């Protein structure tokens, strides 16, 4: 059952009578039961890197091996929970101890027992029925938003020998029993899964459907697919909270997981204060987002292993909800803090440095983490697709993206939303830099846009071209002044200003811009680019004429259209239905057509 | 309840190696157990078990191993880890880095024996920082105001007066007065004259009753310098989270602590990490710096101001680099202002209090503060840009607006930043100086201040 | 075609055997079955990262950037399994592929690969950001075996000369572009403006090509002369007078 401590040196504890141990198995060391991971075996002895502070551990103290590597207790009771990176429940540690601290060597179970949840067994099952890994043997109605699909562990299979009737159960009541090769498994609602092992699936599907954030720049110019991998430069001035809160208040995702990889203590507590108070509309009710998120929060002084395991816990939770057929999203508030934790582990393991002091495996640890994103056919029989979208923020020192964790992340992630302090200093919320930013997902989402938004492919192209042309034209404006540009270039710059001021900016602090649906977004852009095409047409059509058209003529004779175009952002989906917003936008199209027809 | 069992004393020293005495035949040693050594001449020494293996215990002795003797040395094992003899009576008092008193007062009558290492404050029980601490220094309070519960370093360099700034903060620091404040002044690696300055300046210049002062001297044994922040923070946690105080913890030079990590790492024979410091230096600095913040259900809080001598004047160095990842901002002390004889030489431009926007404003200070600080930053930044333009164009080419910004820079350095070491300015007296400077511009030039704030505060 | 796939989440040590399984299969197909095999090895960078991981875990001696001191030998065990052999009709061509870390041509992965493989084709953000597909920057590129694979029976007799003059004009174009960015187009001579017009026409016509557009070598050399003809005959200092007399006016 347990070995004995033989030696100690900082976090490293050598233990004896460990003959039955396994590499990377998880152990409770000392009478205080400090958590530690076996980093080496040397016969009847193990070397355990204790995560927590080892001060006071004694030779001959017990060393209880848990039969498992670092693992997440999955089940009902996740939603709204806050955990540290090794999956300890921070709300329960506080409420059970009545202390402000996390005690050294907490034993508290991560999904609280003695809470009873309403379980419904899946009504088709019977004694003698065949069942396979990922089959849903019931549902737990824990929240109005999220119904937890209880399912067979991925490695389990067999013939059902018992199923619990509809009723109230805690996570350790036996809900299902089944037999295979003459051996019975008794299943709890809690399911334990190794945190560094990918949860398997029937198929890793191509990602094709957009993760609407409700943000014009993001949802139009740099879409992230559901199942997509993306990064944000998480820094002071950038406004990283805007995407985080917008995803929370509106996103096309069913469950959201956050990971704090070792945030600053106050910044972590700002996030943990805010999210209980955030709300979203559901079936015409307004409800707290804590009904559909879980927070894997660590401060910079949590054990190194909690910071390094933080992403692996967050993704293992996210894969668990993905296997229920929920379209999960998740964020890591800085993968650089996770890479500092990984660097420290590596320094304590005494491994060779690679680039900038980071371990050799940093690139493969990042790439194997981001590869756990995607859309999938889940395991088991109910033919359910799910996904995990991963929003891993990066914190390049001084903004230098060549930094190994940032550079490797940007080498892997298919979308970069380049938030920029210069835009935030101009109050250009959401502060996304459209020159630095990119998305690789266009080629997939073009199927969705061709089916549902067939005008958008031209519009997206024209918008990016107008913005790129304005960046070149601004150098000519500096060289020879705005008045020296050609009429085509002047109207391009004026429309680019309209896009920058009243499309790419979005006042998320106010009801009309709190979210911006795709039907609103495409409609606004359809009008701005229709104005561009007709204005530039009138200019080029009247080239070499006596009565030449120019931006000043347009502003004088039909400046009401520019005023209306800037006004279109103020339409509110909560007041006026999308059909009414689209009809008003169609009236602005007719108004500008009649105005251009009045000139040429 | 407590350790009822009698202490073992061992003569079984199997070796000595630099700062380490290697006991053998030890019965069930603890890692980091404190031990009391007796030399052959009867001199008492202290040490802590640095490593254990079966019957062996590698004691890191505090004082140097001069006089240790494998045949006649004896080592009394305490059975326990290091505990602070903590109490509220540590305010008004001066301790050396071990926690032994040096103010000629008695030993501390402990209210509890808290473990020096503490435990992590639960992320769920932290609460966001929300009210200012006045430091008394205008270049901090009116430009970089410190939210109570913030961590904010004073980045400095060898030769700069950061110790005088830290002592001035300790004398002047307090709540805003729109009672229960205290300072813990943990001083590490202090040369003997700077230790006389801290001890004597706090005694003479009207401060002791609010402050607990730890003095680890430059030549005090290095592991006592490692203990000193843990010892001080354990006191600050007692005062803040049990006596409900608002504590300010000042750490006087984290670079001399970082040098002590490097030495204690080499004592364990760990391989040197990034630029010779331990790989885990980030976790150790977090273990110091994160013993800070407000907490839910308690009025008390710990602010921290880690002073930090940047090696080679370079903020890229791992000591300031890792500090900048953990602390909410920085304050920069600048050799340019110091050579210009501007005291305190705090450069308000590369300084940034990350939480100032939640320290100040209506019901926390005066409601103008956020606007005044943003506009003072703009007028100083533009005035520096104009001094760099005057170098090129010559004074007659400057516009009237440029000449105002150049006069603002002269007066801002001579009245706002310049303060002197015994002048204490409330946030209100600092904002009044802020206005009497901004009042140099035409009202329309104050573009970073709203017209409402101007109509209330621009009229003199 | 045969595919060996090691995905990003598959165990990193398999990367070391993955290109060896591919080459072992290619040796069977190309020497036992005498096929012309083309071997494509994708992200030799991820192979070299697996070498760096193993050495870091074994504590083997580091060369540059922590890669194994023997990395050239290990890459040679992969890359030298290429080429024709006596009495076999078959052949193993290889096109390794690698992401250069931080764009650094001097990095150990592209450097040791550059010392083993015969020539390197380079692709560049300085072309791709300007939408120039395929983004092949000729200037740092070179094919060591090209000198033999061109001229009569293989390609037109001009090819060896035309290639070297395209390099001269493209390179001088980059050099006068670097001058223009300091001194402006007023300091450039009429010939320096022609090297800038060459650079523009070269990237637009010679490099840029559709993903399903196929161009013969002969069509490529015709486009080569349609660009070299921008300069007066006497400027073409890499080409022989006989080659100019046969091909410059055509």
């Amino acid at each position: 059952t347990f070995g004995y401590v033989h030696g100690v040196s900082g976090p490293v504890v050598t233990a004896c009578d460990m003959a039955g141990a396994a590499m990377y198995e998880l152990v409770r060391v000392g009478h205080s039961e400090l958590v530690g991971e076996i980093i080496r075996l040397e016969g009847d002895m193990a070397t355990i890197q204790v995560y927590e502070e080892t001060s006071g551990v004694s030779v001959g103290d017990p060393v209880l091996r848990t039969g498992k590597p670092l693992s997440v207790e999955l089940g009902p009771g996740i939603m709204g929970a806050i955990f540290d990176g090794i999956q300890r429940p921070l709300s329960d540690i506080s409420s059970q101890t009545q202390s402000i601290y996390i005690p050294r060597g907490v034993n508290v179970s991560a999904l609280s027992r003695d809470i009873k949840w309403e379980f419904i067994p899946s009504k088709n099952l019977r004694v003698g029925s065949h069942i396979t890994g990922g089959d849903i043997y019931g549902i737990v109605n824990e929240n109005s938003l999220i119904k937890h699909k209880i399912m067979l562990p991925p490695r389990s299979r067999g013939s059902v020998t018992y199923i619990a009737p509809p009723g109230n159960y805690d996570a350790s009541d036996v809900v299902l029993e089944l037999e295979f090769e003459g051996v019975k498994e008794k299943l709890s609602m809690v399911q334990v899964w190794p945190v560094r092992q990918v949860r398997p699936v029937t198929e890793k599907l191509p990602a094709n459907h957009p993760l609407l954030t409700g943000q014009r720049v993001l949802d139009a110019l740099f879409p992230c697919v559901q199942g997509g991998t993306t990064a944000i430069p998480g820094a002071f001035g950038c406004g990283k909270t805007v995407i985080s809160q917008s995803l929370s208040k509106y996103s096309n995702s069913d469950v959201i997981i956050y990971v704090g990889c070792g945030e600053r203590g106050n910044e972590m507590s700002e996030v943990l204060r805010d999210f209980p108070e955030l709300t979203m509309e559901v079936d015409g009710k307004v409800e707290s987002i804590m009904k559909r998120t879980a927070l894997v929060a660590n401060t910079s002084n949590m054990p190194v292993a909690a910071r390094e395991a933080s992403i692996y816990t967050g993704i293992t939770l996210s894969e668990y909800f993905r296997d229920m057929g929920y379209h999960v999203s998740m964020m890591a508030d800085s993968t650089s803090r996770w890479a500092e934790a990984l660097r420290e582990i590596s320094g304590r393991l005494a491994e060779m440095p690679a680039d900038s002091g980071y371990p050799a495996y940093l690139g493969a640890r990042l790439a194997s983490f981001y590869e756990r994103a995607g859309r999938v056919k889940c395991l088991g029989n109910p033919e359910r697709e799910g996904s995990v979208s991963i929003v891993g923020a990066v914190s390049p020192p001084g903004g230098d993206f060549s930094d190994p964790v940032t550079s490797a992340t940007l080498g892997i992630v298919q979308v970069f939303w380049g938030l920029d302090k210069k835009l935030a200093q101009r109050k250009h919320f959401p502060s996304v830099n459209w020159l630095i930013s990119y998305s690789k997902y266009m080629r997939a989402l073009d199927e969705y846009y061709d089916k549902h938004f067939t005008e958008f492919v031209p519009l997206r192209t024209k918008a990016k071209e107008i913005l790129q042309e304005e960046e070149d034209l601004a150098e000519i404006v500096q060289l020879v002044g705005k008045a020296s540009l050609a009429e085509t270039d002047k109207i391009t710059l004026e429309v680019a200003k309209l896009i920058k001021d009243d499309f790419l900016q979005q006042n998320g602090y106010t009801p009309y811009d709190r979210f911006c649906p795709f039907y609103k977004t495409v409609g606004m852009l359809s009008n701005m680019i229709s104005f561009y095409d007709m204005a530039r047409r009138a200019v080029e059509t009247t080239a070499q004429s006596d009565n030449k058209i120019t931006w000043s003529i347009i502003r004088e004779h039909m400046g009401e259209i520019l005023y209306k175009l800037s006004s279109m952002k103020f339409k509110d989906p909560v007041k006026d239905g999308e059909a009414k917003i689209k009809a008003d936008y169609a009236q602005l199209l007719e108004d500008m057509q009649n105005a251009f027809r009045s000139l040429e | 309840n407590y350790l009822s069992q009698p202490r073992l004393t061992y003569k079984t020293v199997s070796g000595v190696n630099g700062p380490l005495v290697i006991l053998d035949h030890v019965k069930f040693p603890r890692y980091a157990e404190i031990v009391h050594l007796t030399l052959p001449d009867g001199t008492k020494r202290s040490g802590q078990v640095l490593e254990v293996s079966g019957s062996k215990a590698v004691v890191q002795v505090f004082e140097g191993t001069s006089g240790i003797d494998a045949k006649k040395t004896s080592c009394e094992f305490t059975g326990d880890i290091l505990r602070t003899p903590v109490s509220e009576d540590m305010l008004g008092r001066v301790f050396n880095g071990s926690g032994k008193p040096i103010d000629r007062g008695p030993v501390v009558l402990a209210e509890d024996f808290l473990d020096i290492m503490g435990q992590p404050i639960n992320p769920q029980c932290r609460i966001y920082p929300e009210e200012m601490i006045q430091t008394g220094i205008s270049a901090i309070d009116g430009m970089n105001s410190i939210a109570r519960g913030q961590k904010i370093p004073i980045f400095s360099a060898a030769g700069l007066p950061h110790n005088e700034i830290a002592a001035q903060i300790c004398r002047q620091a307090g709540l805003v007065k729109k009672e229960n404040f205290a300072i813990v002044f943990a001083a590490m690696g202090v040369n003997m004259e700077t230790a006389r300055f801290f001890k004597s300046d706090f005694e003479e210049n009207g401060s002791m009753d609010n402050v607990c002062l730890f003095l680890n001297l430059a030549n005090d044994p290095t592991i006592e310098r490692i203990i000193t922040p843990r010892l001080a923070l354990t006191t600050a946690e007692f005062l803040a989270y049990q006596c409900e105080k608002h504590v300010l913890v000042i750490l006087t030079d984290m670079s001399s602590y970082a040098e002590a990590l490097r030495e204690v790492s080499a004592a364990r024979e760990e391989v040197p990490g990034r630029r010779g410091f331990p790989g885990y230096m980030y976790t150790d600095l977090a273990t110091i710096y994160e013993r800070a913040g407000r907490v839910e259900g308690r009025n008390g809080s710990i602010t921290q101001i880690p002073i930090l001598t940047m090696p080679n004047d370079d903020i890229t160095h791992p000591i300031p680099d890792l500090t900048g990842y953990i602390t909410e901002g920085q304050i920069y002390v600048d050799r340019q202002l110091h050579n210009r004889q501007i005291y305190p030489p705090i450069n308000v431009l590369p300084s940034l209090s990350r939480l100032m926007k939640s320290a100040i404003g209506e019901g926390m200070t005066r409601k103008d503060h956020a606007d005044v600080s943003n506009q003072l930053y703009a007028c100083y930044a533009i005035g520096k840009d104009v001094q760099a333009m005057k170098a090129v164009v010559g004074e007659e080419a400057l516009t009237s607006d440029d000449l105002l910004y150049l006069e603002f820079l002269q007066k801002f350095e001579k009245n706002f930043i310049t303060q002197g070491p015994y002048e204490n300015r409330t946030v209100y007296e600092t904002l009044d100086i802020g206005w009497q400077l901004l009042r140099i511009f035409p009202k329309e030039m104050l573009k970073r201040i709203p017209q409402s704030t101007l109509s209330e505060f621009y009229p003199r | 075609v045969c595919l060996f796939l090691n995905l990003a989440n598959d165990p990193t040590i398999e990367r070391i055997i993955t290109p060896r399984l591919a080459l072992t299969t290619a040796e069977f197909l190309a020497y036992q079955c005498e096929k012309h095999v083309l071997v494509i090895l994708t992200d030799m960078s991820s192979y070299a990262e697996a070498l760096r991981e193993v050495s870091a875990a074994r504590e083997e001696v580091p060369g540059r950037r922590g890669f194994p001191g023997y990395m050239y030998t290990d890459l040679a065990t992969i890359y030298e399994r290429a080429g024709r052999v006596e009495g076999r009709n078959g052949s193993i061509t290889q096109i390794p592929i690698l992401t250069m870390p931080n764009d650094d041509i001097t990095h150990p992965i592209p450097d040791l690969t550059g010392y083993i493989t015969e020539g390197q084709i380079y692709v560049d953000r300085q072309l791709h950001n300007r939408q120039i597909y395929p983004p092949i920057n000729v200037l740092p590129s070179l094919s060591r075996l090209m000198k033999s694979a061109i001229g009569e029976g293989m390609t037109r007799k001009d090819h060896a000369d035309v290639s070297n003059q395209l390099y001269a004009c493209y390179a001088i174009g980059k050099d006068v572009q670097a001058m223009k960015a300091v001194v402006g187009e007023e300091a450039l001579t009429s010939d320096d403006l022609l090297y800038l017009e060459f650079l523009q026409k070269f990237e637009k016509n010679f490099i840029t090509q559709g993903p399903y557009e196929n161009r013969t070598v002969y069509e490529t050399l015709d486009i080569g002369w349609q660009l070299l003809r921008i300069f007066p005959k006497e400027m073409l200092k890499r080409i022989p007078q006989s080659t100019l007399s046969e091909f410059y006016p055509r």
């Binding site: 005494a350 060779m352 440095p353 | 024979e269 391989v271 040197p272 | 504590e59 580091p62």
Partner: peptide
């Protein structure tokens, strides 16, 4: 780092040899 890591390994090997020689 590599030199110092090999030195620390060689010292560990010397300790192991000494522990065997004490048999």
């Amino acid at each position: 780092f590599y030199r110092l890591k090999k030195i620390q390994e060689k010292k560990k090997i010397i300790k192991e040899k000494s522990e065997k020689d004490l048999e």
